[PDB]
């Protein structure tokens, strides 16, 4: 059962310069510029004027599922260049304090003393992502950037770098976890 036409629309803010050509969307705002390649989607992107219209013709239920995904990605780009994204992480430990060392212009972090281990864990932030230790809150990291995927993925790298092993993780709750998914 292929529906003849499935379409969804979104409103482009007033202070955003959106450029679309051959499923190559470029969004420019006060914070910077973001671009995503949507050539892998068999959809029809159109700017009508400002609004963005995405249509799928004679697409199966799987094909039409990408319509909302495309709009959400475009919406994230608009929010990235307007408000930005801010992910907050909290150190969790029972006995050994977790020591963090920001270096390289807030583009890198080193974790020491995780569960008393002498190994040093080094994580490099992705492009456009900066990590800063919060001062208002105790043992809190703040990651900021424009691309949600890069900021969120940077937080995931830190979280997975500090997994406890050979222990009951239910009791050994040590680690660095994302506590807030917000925007600047």
């Amino acid at each position: 059962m292929k529906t003849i036409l499935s379409s969804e629309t979104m409103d482009i803010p007033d202070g955003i310069t959106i450029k679309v050509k051959a499923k190559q969307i470029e969004v420019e705002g006060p914070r910077g510029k973001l671009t995503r390649n949507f050539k892998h989607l068999n959809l029809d992107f159109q700017l009508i004027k400002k609004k963005l219209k995405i249509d799928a013709w004679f697409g199966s239920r799987k094909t039409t599922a990408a319509i909302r995904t495309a709009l959400s990605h475009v919406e994230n780009l608009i929010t990235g260049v307007t408000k930005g994204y801010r992910y907050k992480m909290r150190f969790v430990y029972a006995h050994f304090p977790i020591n963090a060392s920001i270096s390289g212009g807030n583009k890198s972090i080193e974790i020491r003393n995780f569960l008393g281990e002498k190994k040093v864990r080094k994580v490099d932030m992705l492009d456009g992502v900066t990590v800063v230790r919060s001062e208002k809150v105790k043992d809190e990291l703040v990651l900021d950037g424009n691309d949600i995927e890069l900021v969120s993925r940077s937080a995931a790298l830190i979280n997975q770098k500090c997994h406890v092993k050979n222990k009951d993780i239910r009791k050994f709750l040590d680690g660095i976890y994302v506590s807030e998914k917000g925007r600047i």
Binding site: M1, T3, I4, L5, W57, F58
Partner: protein
């Protein structure tokens, strides 16, 4: 012009006997590829539904039924019974076609595709021309639009005839919707 399946009215009765000099006359509307196969399927049902075998029966009339308006589009509903690999089932199907012959051809093709049901495992219970407002299947409803509009997403690239076919060409096909 040419149809795979033809609709026939077959009329028959049991042979007259001393007890019944005027036995009941039975009629059926059957689908078959030609008259000979229509008659054979008529006796199949009379044998199993009225207990009248061809050996003790009489064929009276056979006439082919043609679509009245073969130039307009109608919605056709088909009630059928079919045999799967594990039993028997009933289903209702809808089709859009200019003639009921085409709609029946689509039904057999669909049953073969979606259910692997061969022709001889299908019995047509009822057929009817459904008005647009009484259709049930969404595959038929979506084309009930006065402003029907869509592009040709998939095109078949080919020369008008094989006379203009060449193995090699200087440039790739130029396609746009």
């Amino acid at each position: 012009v040419t149809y795979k399946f033809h609709q026939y009215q077959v009329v028959g009765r049991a042979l007259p006997s001393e007890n019944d000099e005027h036995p009941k006359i039975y009629r059926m509307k059957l689908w078959a590829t030609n008259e000979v196969r229509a008659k054979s399927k008529f006796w199949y049902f009379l044998r199993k539904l009225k207990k009248v075998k061809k050996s003790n029966g009489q064929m009276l009339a056979i006439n082919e039924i043609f679509e009245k308006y073969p130039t307009t589009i109608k919605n056709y509903g088909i009630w059928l019974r079919y045999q799967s690999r594990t039993g028997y089932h009933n289903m209702y199907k809808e089709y859009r076609d200019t003639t009921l012959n085409g709609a029946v051809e689509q039904m057999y093709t669909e049953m073969a595709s979606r259910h692997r049901v061969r022709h001889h495992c299908i019995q047509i219970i009822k057929t009817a021309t459904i008005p647009a407002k009484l259709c049930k299947r969404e595959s038929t409803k979506q084309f009930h639009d006065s402003k029907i509009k869509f592009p040709l997403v998939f095109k078949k690239v080919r020369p008008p005839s094989r006379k203009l076919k060449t193995t090699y060409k200087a440039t790739k096909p130029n396609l746009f919707m």
